[PDB]
Design an enzyme around this catalytic site. Structure first.
Site, PDB file in Angstrom:
ATOM      1  N   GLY A 132      20.259  69.975  29.476  1.00 30.87           N
ATOM      2  CA  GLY A 132      18.921  70.507  29.749  1.00 30.87           C
ATOM      3  C   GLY A 132      17.981  69.339  30.083  1.00 30.87           C
ATOM      4  O   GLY A 132      17.229  69.886  31.005  1.00 30.87           O
TER       5      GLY A 132
ATOM      6  N   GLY B  22      25.679  66.873  26.027  1.00 32.99           N
ATOM      7  CA  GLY B  22      26.294  66.340  24.899  1.00 32.99           C
ATOM      8  C   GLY B  22      27.628  67.083  24.645  1.00 32.99           C
ATOM      9  O   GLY B  22      28.832  66.352  24.533  1.00 32.99           O
TER      10      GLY B  22
ATOM     11  N   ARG C 248      26.855  59.267  24.018  1.00 40.45           N
ATOM     12  CA  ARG C 248      25.506  58.993  23.701  1.00 40.45           C
ATOM     13  C   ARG C 248      25.053  57.769  23.278  1.00 40.45           C
ATOM     14  O   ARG C 248      24.194  56.972  23.498  1.00 40.45           O
ATOM     15  CB  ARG C 248      24.695  60.432  23.192  1.00 40.45           C
ATOM     16  CG  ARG C 248      24.430  61.438  24.216  1.00 40.45           C
ATOM     17  CD  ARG C 248      23.903  62.949  23.826  1.00 40.45           C
ATOM     18  NE  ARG C 248      23.327  63.684  24.580  1.00 40.45           N
ATOM     19  CZ  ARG C 248      23.031  65.051  24.297  1.00 40.45           C
ATOM     20  NH1 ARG C 248      23.007  65.269  23.352  1.00 40.45           N
ATOM     21  NH2 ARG C 248      22.545  65.773  25.462  1.00 40.45           N
TER      22      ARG C 248
ATOM     23  N   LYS D  68      22.744  77.601  24.262  1.00 37.50           N
ATOM     24  CA  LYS D  68      21.436  77.515  23.992  1.00 37.50           C
ATOM     25  C   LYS D  68      20.480  78.666  24.973  1.00 37.50           C
ATOM     26  O   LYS D  68      19.705  77.907  25.862  1.00 37.50           O
ATOM     27  CB  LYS D  68      20.767  76.093  24.164  1.00 37.50           C
ATOM     28  CG  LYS D  68      21.031  75.143  22.967  1.00 37.50           C
ATOM     29  CD  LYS D  68      21.182  73.503  23.569  1.00 37.50           C
ATOM     30  CE  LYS D  68      21.233  72.688  22.410  1.00 37.50           C
ATOM     31  NZ  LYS D  68      21.179  71.214  22.496  1.00 37.50           N
TER      32      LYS D  68
HETATM   33  N1  LA8 Z   1      28.866  81.934  22.558  1.00 36.08           N
HETATM   34  C1  LA8 Z   1      29.071  80.788  22.194  1.00 36.08           C
HETATM   35  N2  LA8 Z   1      28.713  80.280  21.078  1.00 36.08           N
HETATM   36  C2  LA8 Z   1      28.610  79.020  20.688  1.00 36.08           C
HETATM   37  N3  LA8 Z   1      28.953  78.008  21.643  1.00 36.08           N
HETATM   38  C3  LA8 Z   1      29.450  78.702  22.965  1.00 36.08           C
HETATM   39  C4  LA8 Z   1      29.261  79.883  23.146  1.00 36.08           C
HETATM   40  N4  LA8 Z   1      29.782  80.206  24.380  1.00 36.08           N
HETATM   41  C5  LA8 Z   1      30.140  78.825  24.966  1.00 36.08           C
HETATM   42  N5  LA8 Z   1      29.845  78.008  24.020  1.00 36.08           N
HETATM   43  C6  LA8 Z   1      29.964  76.419  24.201  1.00 36.08           C
HETATM   44  O1  LA8 Z   1      28.726  75.776  24.463  1.00 36.08           O
HETATM   45  C7  LA8 Z   1      28.648  74.559  23.828  1.00 36.08           C
HETATM   46  C8  LA8 Z   1      27.376  74.218  23.545  1.00 36.08           C
HETATM   47  O2  LA8 Z   1      26.692  73.633  24.736  1.00 36.08           O
HETATM   48  P1  LA8 Z   1      25.014  73.220  24.897  1.00 36.08           P
HETATM   49  O3  LA8 Z   1      24.646  72.509  23.432  1.00 36.08           O
HETATM   50  O4  LA8 Z   1      24.305  74.675  24.992  1.00 36.08           O
HETATM   51  O5  LA8 Z   1      25.073  72.404  26.248  1.00 36.08           O
HETATM   52  P2  LA8 Z   1      25.408  70.917  26.339  1.00 36.08           P
HETATM   53  O6  LA8 Z   1      25.666  70.270  25.089  1.00 36.08           O
HETATM   54  O7  LA8 Z   1      23.723  70.539  26.784  1.00 36.08           O
HETATM   55  O8  LA8 Z   1      26.040  70.497  27.440  1.00 36.08           O
HETATM   56  C9  LA8 Z   1      29.190  75.002  22.366  1.00 36.08           C
HETATM   57  O9  LA8 Z   1      29.961  73.523  21.895  1.00 36.08           O
HETATM   58  C10 LA8 Z   1      30.577  75.865  22.872  1.00 36.08           C
HETATM   59  O10 LA8 Z   1      31.611  75.116  23.129  1.00 36.08           O
HETATM   60  F1  ALF Z   2      22.651  70.496  23.997  1.00 39.92           F
HETATM   61 AL1  ALF Z   2      22.152  69.824  25.797  1.00 39.92          AL
HETATM   62  F2  ALF Z   2      21.497  69.125  27.055  1.00 39.92           F
HETATM   63  F3  ALF Z   2      23.221  68.505  25.389  1.00 39.92           F
HETATM   64  F4  ALF Z   2      21.303  71.433  25.576  1.00 39.92           F
HETATM   65 CL    CL Z   3      17.775  77.732  22.583  1.00 45.61          CL
HETATM   66 MG    MG Z   4      25.117  70.523  23.355  1.00 41.28          MG
END
Ligand code: LA8
Ligand code: ALF
Ligand code: CL
Ligand code: MG
Length: 410
Positions: free
Chosen positions: A390, A367, A37, A209
């Site tokens: 997102g 990210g 990023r 999320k």
């Molecule tokens: N139950 C759980 N609790 C935490 N992380 C989880 C999980 N199940 C899968 N993950 C994975 O989700 C990751 C968070 O991804 P996000 O920020 O939602 O999407 P983005 O960064 O936009 O692409 C987190 O690092 C873990 O590896």
């Molecule tokens: F954590 Al993201 F798009 F990077 F929800």
């Molecule tokens: Cl959320």
């Molecule tokens: Mg993320």
């Protein structure tokens, strides 16, 4: 962006540039695990400096501190150190983002000064709700007025944050508000890729999320032909649809209320949903948790969380990938950072790379999800890796992003 001001059209000579960027980098042991990023903002920062900018003041959120200062855990100081080596120029890190000293420090800097502010979300006014509390109107306006003092012109290159109508993205009040080159680059690629997707078009929705991203599915269901709902997203669906025992797995109370409606809609639109069917389980949320197995039938024992899918889930996920001619993927299907819980995202990554090699258009974003690509060296083995996750799901929905909408017009 065809009728917004962009940075190629913004005279920056002698001006102080205040720039929103998404420097919300993944962290572990207080070190950055992926500078993707930060690197992606460099071209806009170099352009300003190369073109006579007096200063570039850079600002971002990191994490979700919820309106409380947390330098311990969510400070941007590390990003300042990394930004120095990628620019080959010094970066002044400031320990706040608003107030008289930040204003003094940014009021009239030496020529070519780059400044990085502290985490915007240490102030409740950026979001502004937090902790549980709603921001006060007068103080949002005040926080917005402070941020506006720091530059003569504004640039928004925070693609990864463009889905957020927060103070720093939509509330800065300067005559000229320009989209940067990264915002530009991501919006064009997606306007192309989403124009007439190749079909079957699969969306792969995972991550952590759940509250936010479970609310995106409804509009997505009008656009895609298949959807993998995995990772942390899966457990709300599976409690409702299978009365599955879920333990301490992530659950959304609001999301669970609409799950029956989203499945009715998936059916009505011929969108095939593939949910996980087995798991790797944890006795707590820790890299060295004692681990186990569960299926949807066994349930997950009280006290344990699902932190990856199992081999039979990987097999169903592979079948959906095999049928796809276009994939947009946001959210790992397990906690890939920790190796006890990485096999399932690694196997899904392997499918997605194999799919690309026989002509499937593959798009991975976010990210944490783009960090999968770094970690297994698959960044050049898929079609496109985006700094937005997102933000990209909200472009798939068909939304104008609030951080694009707030830009000046031509
Ligand atoms: N139950 C759980 N609790 C935490 N992380 C989880 C999980 N199940 C899968 N993950 C994975 O989700 C990751 C968070 O991804 P996000 O920020 O939602 O999407 P983005 O960064 O936009 O692409 C987190 O690092 C873990 O590896
Ligand atoms: F954590 Al993201 F798009 F990077 F929800
Ligand atoms: Cl959320
Ligand atoms: Mg993320």
């Amino acid at each position: 962006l065809s009728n917004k001001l962009t940075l190629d059209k913004l005279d920056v000579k002698g001006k102080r540039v205040v720039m929103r960027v998404d420097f919300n980098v993944p962290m572990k042991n207080n070190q950055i695990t992926n500078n993707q990023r930060i690197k992606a903002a460099v071209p806009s920062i170099k352009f300003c400096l190369d073109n006579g900018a007096k200063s570039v003041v850079l600002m971002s959120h990191l994490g979700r501190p919820d309106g409380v200062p947390m330098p311990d855990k969510y400070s941007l100081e590390p990003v300042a150190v990394e930004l120095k080596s990628l620019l080959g120029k010094d970066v002044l890190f400031l320990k706040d983002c608003v107030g008289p000293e930040v204003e003094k420090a940014c009021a009239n800097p030496a020529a070519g000064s780059v400044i990085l502010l502290e985490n915007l979300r240490f102030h409740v006014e950026e979001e502004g709700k937090g902790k549980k509390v709603k921001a006060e109107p007068a103080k949002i306006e005040a926080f917005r007025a402070s941020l506006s003092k720091l530059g003569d012109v504004y640039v928004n290159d925070a693609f990864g944050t463009a889905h957020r109508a927060h103070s720093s993205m939509v509330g800065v009040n300067l005559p000229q508000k320009a989209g940067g080159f990264l915002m530009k680059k991501e919006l064009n690629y997606f306007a192309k890729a989403l124009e007439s997707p190749e079909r079957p078009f699969l969306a792969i929705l995972g991550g952590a999320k759940v509250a936010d991203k479970i609310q995106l599915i409804n509009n997505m269901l009008d656009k895609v032909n298949e959807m993998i709902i995995g990772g942390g997203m899966a457990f709300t669906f599976l409690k409702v649809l299978n009365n599955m025992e879920i333990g301490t797995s992530l659950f959304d109370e609001e999301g669970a209320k609409i799950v029956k409606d989203l499945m009715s809609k998936a059916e009505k639109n011929g969108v095939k949903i593939t949910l996980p069917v087995d798991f790797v389980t944890a006795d707590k949320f820790d890299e060295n948790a004692k681990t186990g197995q569960a299926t949807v039938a066994s349930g997950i024992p009280a006290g344990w969380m699902g932190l990856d899918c199992g081999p039979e889930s990987s097999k169903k996920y592979a079948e959906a990938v095999t049928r796809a001619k276009q994939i947009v993927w946001n959210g790992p299907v397990g906690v890939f950072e920790w190796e006890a819980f990485a096999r399932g995202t690694k196997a899904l990554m392997d499918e997605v790379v194999k799919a690309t090699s026989r002509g499937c258009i593959t798009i991975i974003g976010g990210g944490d999800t783009a960090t999968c690509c770094a970690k297994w060296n698959t960044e050049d083995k898929v079609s496109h890796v985006s700094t937005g996750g997102g933000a990209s799901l909200e472009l798939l929905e068909g939304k104008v992003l609030p951080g694009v909408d707030a830009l000046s017009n031509i």
